[PDB]
Amino acid sequence: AKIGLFFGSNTGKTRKVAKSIKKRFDDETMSDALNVNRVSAEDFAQYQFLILGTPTLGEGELPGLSSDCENESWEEFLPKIEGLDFSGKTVALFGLGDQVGYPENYLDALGELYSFFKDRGAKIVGSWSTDGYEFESSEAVVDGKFVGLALDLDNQSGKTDERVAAWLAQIAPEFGLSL
Numbered sequence: 001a002k003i004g005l006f007f008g009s010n011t012g013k014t015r016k017v018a019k020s021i022k023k024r025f026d027d028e029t030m031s032d033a034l035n036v037n038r039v040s041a042e043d044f045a046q047y048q049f050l051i052l053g054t055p056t057l058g059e060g061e062l063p064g065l066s067s068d069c070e071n072e073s074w075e076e077f078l079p080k081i082e083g084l085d086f087s088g089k090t091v092a093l094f095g096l097g098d099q100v101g102y103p104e105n106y107l108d109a110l111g112e113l114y115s116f117f118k119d120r121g122a123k124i125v126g127s128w129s130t131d132g133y134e135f136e137s138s139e140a141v142v143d144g145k146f147v148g149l150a151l152d153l154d155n156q157s158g159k160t161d162e163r164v165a166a167w168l169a170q171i172a173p174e175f176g177l178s179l
């Protein structure tokens, strides 16, 4: 497939969102939603286009064993790919979090993922307005916008599909999407 769709998850919400993205696209356009704990670095590296999802867990951390997840996740995956260059590749990110429960750390892990790929040369697309969210601080906010799609399936699950649909339309020119 042209676009690799990868996520990490501990209670399945990020997996559900990822599947809700893939259901919109055919198998030449997009890979099935793949948990990073099941992907090799070489397979991840094949894709010139990536859509990457993560929750924020612990407090402000990527999913993985150190944030008390059942299985390894993004925490243990990033070192496997940290020596790779993402220049010329296009990346869009989505984050899940709980803006009420974690008002000072909402979507922090989305910011960590953004930084990882930006520092390694990726072209990142898909920034998102902070309107309609209530929070105090987020490492995912850069220049007044979230660095990727912001979701909240604890407080705003009924907004997810509309948000995903609008975000996909926004990134469609960069990802060569037909909706």
Ligand SMILES: Cc1cc2nc3c(=O)[nH]c(=O)nc-3n(C[C@H](O)[C@H](O)[C@H](O)COP(=O)(O)O)c2cc1C
Pocket (backbone or CB within 6 Å): 008, 009, 010, 011, 012, 013, 014, 015, 055, 056, 057, 058, 059, 060, 061, 096, 097, 098, 099, 102, 105, 106, 107, 108, 153, 154
């Ligand atoms: C122990 C724990 C810690 C969390 N920490 C944060 C946090 O720091 N920031 C945030 O935005 N959301 C936080 N959340 C909310 C989760 O990211 C949110 O519930 C998400 O939907 C979980 O996704 P998953 O089912 O894919 O694991 C936390 C949730 C739990 C259970």
Ligand SMILES: [Mg+2]
Pocket (backbone or CB within 6 Å): 026, 028, 029
């Ligand atoms: Mg097609």
Ligand SMILES: [Mg+2]
Pocket (backbone or CB within 6 Å): 027, 032
């Ligand atoms: Mg297949």
Ligand SMILES: [Mg+2]
Pocket (backbone or CB within 6 Å): 079
């Ligand atoms: Mg190493």
